[PDB]
C-alpha cells in the first residue's frame, strides 16, 4: 500500500534479499532491495552524520554518510520523483532491530524543501531539531519510537539499563505534509541531515536507520521489523 | 475557550466594543478589545504588507503594516507569551466580513520560529508565495479557499472577485509550533504576509488578523463581522 | 591569467569560436568555448531567471534558465571544482556588448555557499539583492557596470535615452571572498540565482550575461568586450 | 575618530571610568562608558554564548549572555542607529587585555542583517581556518589554532598575555539601515571561552559595528577593548 523512497543506513547484511556482504548505505525506490549501495564503515558507539540531497535539475538522489576524521561513504541514483511519489508526502526517519539489535538514536534532524513555480516565486519548508522533547507535537511517532530521554529520539526500544531490544521498529514523521514536486515548478529541491548514534553489545548489530519519504498517511507495515527497516511489508 | 494572541488589521471601527474611530492595527491578547492600537490608513485596492515580530528578550510583540511609498503604521505591546499561550500552538491568518464586506485576499505568507535550549536551536520556517488548489500544509477553516490566481482567499468572494457579507475563514499551518519553552535561553518569531483588501463599499469591513492559538483552535461559533474569526464574544 | 568558471547566457552565436548557431547557455571552464551547451530561447524585453547549482557529492555544475510560461533551458556538466578553482574565490556577474548590443540589466541576485568540515560543523555565506542602490558598498563594480538606476544593476553601458551601447563590458563582484572548496570538508555546495532583463533594438542582440567564479583579485581582461563576455582574454 | 556601537562583555571593573563594581555586559554607544549595563557572572574557563538583536521597529538594541544551566544576563537600550551609525558599516568582534589577562577565544560567530525597501546578508563561522580570507584581522587576532579565532595573544599552550588587543571584522560592508526601508534588522551570535590563571581576569570581548574603515585605536589595549581612543 505505501509508496516509499528512502536512503538506508543498513547495518546488517541480509544477503538473501540483495544486501552486499557488508554494512552499507543504499537508495531504496519502492523496494527494500536497494537500487544502489555503497560500502559503509559503521562505527559502533560513535556519532555519525547523514546528508541527503535531491534537486529537480539533475534528478539525482544522493547521500553521504560520515563520521569525524573518517572517509565518508556516498551513494547516488538518478530517479525522477515525479514518477515515483505523490506530489504531497511526509518525511521521516525509521529504524528497526531483529534477532540482532542496536540503539537507533537520533541526536538531530533537519530538512528543507523548496518549490519554484513555472508561472510565478518559491514556496519553502525548513525545520530543525537539535534537541527532542518529551512531548514533541510537531512529530508523528509510530511504533516503538520515543522522545525526551536525553533530548534525543530513540527510534527503536531501549530498556531501563540502556540496552537496545530486539524485534523493535519505530518511525518519526514531520507533522506537516511537504509538497515534494509540482509539474508547474521550474526548480524543486530538498535536503535532509541527521546525526545518529548506533551502539550494540553484539559483534553483529542490526538492522539500521533510514530517511524516507512517503505518502502522507504512511504507517509502519505490520511485521516490518528486522531487515525490512519499518519501511516495507516484504522483501520484494 | 480557545486562547488567542493576534495582530489585527481592523478595517471597521466598532466603537460600541472599544475600537477607535478609524481603521487601525492592534494587538489582541485573549480579547478582541486590543491592548494597544495605532491608526492605519488602509488603501482600498492596493497590496499591503504586514510584518510581526516577537522575541523573548524584550518580550515585546510588534507589528508594522505598510503600502509602497506611504508611511507605515506600527504597534507594540509588552507581553510575556510564556504566561498567555500554551507551550505548543498553531499559527494562522483569519478574516471576516459582516454587514459590510471586503476581499480578504492573501498573496503571500511567511513565518519563522526559533527556540534556543538552556542545555542549540530548534527552528521552523515556512514560505508561501503561491497557494495551490490543494494546499495540504494548510488547515482551511470556514470560508477560506485556495487556488484562485494562486491566492488564499480568507472570506467568500464570487467568480469575479466580488466580496460577500457574513463570511469568516482562517488558514492555519499544519504543524504545531514550539513557541516557548522555559528552558530556552532565547525564543523568537517573525511572520510576514501580503494582502489585498478591496471593497465596492464606502465602509469596508471587517479585517485580517495574524494569530497564534491553541493547536486545536477553530473558528468560534458566530464570530463573523467584528469578531474577526478569533473570539466567541466582544468581552 | 585569471581562473574562471562560469555559466554563460550567450545571446550571440559566434560560430567561428565554437558557439552553436543559436542563443544558448553554457558551462565554461577556463575557456569561453563552453564545455557543454543547450539551446536557449532568449526572449527580448522579458524578465528571465537563472539558477545555478553545485555540490561536492555529485560534482555537477548545473544551470536552468527560464521565463514565465515558457519551457526552460537547462545545462549540466561534471567538473570537480577542487581541481579548477582556488580554494577562495569571488563570485560575480559579467556582461558584454560588441558591434551588436543589448541591455544587460540585473534585477536581483542571490548566492549561498556552505562548507561542512571533516573534523568539526558548517560555515555558510548568503547574500540577497532584490534591489541595488547608487552606492552599493558590498559590490565591487568593474568596467562599465553601474547601480542605482531603478534600483537595478546595469552590467553594460546604457545611454541617457535608455539605448544600450555597443562595445561595453562590466562586472559586479560580491565584496567578501567565498571559501568554495576545502579538502577537509565532508560536503560543500553553492547556489546562485539572478533575474535579468535583456532588451535590444538589434535584429541580432549581443553578447550575453554570465555568472562567474574567479580568483579573488580577478579584473576584466583588457579587450574582453563582445564574444569574450568580460571573462576571458582570448577565444582559446 | 571611528563611530562605534558595541556590546561589551566587560570582565574587569574600571571604576575610575565608570564601570560598575563587577563583571557586566553593556551597550556602548560611541563611548566606553556604557549607556546601560547589567551584572554578569563570568564563568572562568567555560564556553559562553552571546546573542545580540536589534530591529528598526522597536529600535532597541538588546543582548543576552549565558552559559549552559546558569541564569542569563540581559541588557537593552533604545537607540535609533539611523542617527548614530553611517548607512554602511562593518561588523566585528574585539577583545583586549591589559595588566591583567585572559583568553579571548571565539569558537563560532554568526550574523544576519535584513533591509526591506528585502536585501540580506548572512554569515556563519563554526570553524575558523588558518587563512580566513573573509575576515579582516587587526592587531593580535589570529585564526586556525584548534579552528578558533583568538582575538588576543595566547602562547603555544594557550596561556594568555597582557597588553594585547585584536579584532576580526567581516570582510563585506553591511547596509545596516536605509531611510526608505520599512523594516531593518540584525542579529549576531558568538560563542567564547574566557579562561585565566589570574584571580582577576581582564579586559573583555565586544561585538561592534563601525565605520567600514575602522581600525584599532592607538593605545586601546586594556579597558578600552580595542574600540575607543580614550575613556570619555
Ligand atoms: O536483526 C538481524 C536479522 O534478524 C532476523 O534474521 C530477521 O529479523 C532479519 O530480518 C534481521 O535482519
Ligand atoms: O461588517 C460590519 C459590521 O456589520 C454589522 O454591524 C455586524 O455584523 C458587525 O459585527 C460588523 O463589524
Ligand atoms: O557583438 C556581436 C559581435 O560583434 C563583433 O563582431 C565582435 O565585437 C564580436 O565579439 C561580437 O560577438
Ligand atoms: O587589564 C586590567 C587593567 O590593567 C591596567 O590597570 C590598565 O591597562 C587598564 O586599562 C586595564 O583595564
Ligand atoms: Ca540489511
Ligand atoms: Ca472592528
Ligand atoms: Ca557568443
Ligand atoms: Ca572594564
Ligand atoms: Mn540493504
Ligand atoms: Mn479593533
Ligand atoms: Mn557561447
Ligand atoms: Mn564596562
Ligands bound, unique: alpha-D-mannopyranose, calcium ion, manganese (II) ion
Helical content band of chain A: under 10%
> What is the total domain count of chain A?
1
Order of helices and strands of chain A: EEEEEEEEEEEEEEEE
What form of chain A results from the Cα inertia axes?
A: globular
Largest sheet of chain A: 8 strands, antiparallel
CATH architecture of chain A: Sandwich
Strand count of chain A? 16
Number of helical segments with 4 or more residues of chain A: 0
CATH topology of chain A: Jelly Rolls
How far from one another are the termini of chain A?
13 Å
Q: Taking Cα atoms only, what radius of gyration of chain A do you get, to the nearest Å?
A: 17 Å
* Main interface: chain pair and counts: A-B, 29 and 28 residues
Strand content of chain A: 35-45%
Structural class of chain A: mainly beta
Subunit arrangement of the protein: homotetramer
CATH top level class name of chain A: Mainly Beta
Spell out the key features of this protein.
homotetramer; 236 residues; mainly beta; Jelly Rolls; eight-stranded antiparallel sheet; 0% helix; 45% strand; globular; binds alpha-D-mannopyranose; binds calcium ion; binds manganese (II) ion; sugar binding protein; Concanavalin A-like lectins/glucanases; Sugar Binding; tetrameric
Amino acid at each position: 500500500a505505501d509508496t516509499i523512497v528512502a536512503v538506508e543506513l543498513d547495518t546488517y547484511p541480509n544477503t538473501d534479499i540483495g544486501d552486499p556482504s557488508y554494512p552499507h548505505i543504499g537508495i531504496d525506490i519502492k523496494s527494500v532491495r536497494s537500487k544502489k549501495t555503497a560500502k559503509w564503515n559503521m562505527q559502533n558507539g560513535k556519532v555519525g552524520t547523514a546528508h541527503i540531497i535531491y534537486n529537480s535539475v539533475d534528478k539525482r538522489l544522493s547521500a553521504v554518510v560520515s563520521y569525524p576524521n573518517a572517509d565518508s561513504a556516498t551513494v547516488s541514483y538518478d530517479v525522477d520523483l515525479d514518477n515515483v511519489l505523490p506530489e504531497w508526502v511526509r518525511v521521516g526517519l525509521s529504524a528497526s532491530t531483529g534477532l540482532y539489535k542496536e540503539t537507533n538514536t537520533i541526536l538531530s534532524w533537519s530538512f528543507t524543501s523548496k518549490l519554484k513555480s513555472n508561472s510565478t516565486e518559491t514556496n519553502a519548508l525548513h525545520f530543525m531539531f537539535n534537541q527532542f522533547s518529551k512531548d514533541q507535537k510537531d512529530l508523528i511517532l509510530q511504533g516503538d519510537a520515543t522522545t525526551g530521554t536525553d533530548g534525543n529520539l530513540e527510534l527503536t526500544r531501549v530498556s531501563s539499563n540502556g540496552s537496545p531490544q530486539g524485534s523493535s521498529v519505530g518511525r518519526a514523521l514531520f507533522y506537516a505534509p511537504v509538497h515534494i514536486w509540482e509539474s508547474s515548478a521550474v526548480v524543486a529541491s530538498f535536503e535532509a541531515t541527521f546525526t545518529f548514534l548506533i551502539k550494540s553489545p553484539d559483534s553483529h548489530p542490526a538492522d539500521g536507520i533510514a530517511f524516507f519519504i512517503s505518502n502522507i498517511d504512511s504507517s509502519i507495515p505490520s511485521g516490518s521489523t528486522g531487515r525490512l527497516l519499518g519501511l516495507f511489508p516484504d522483501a520484494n
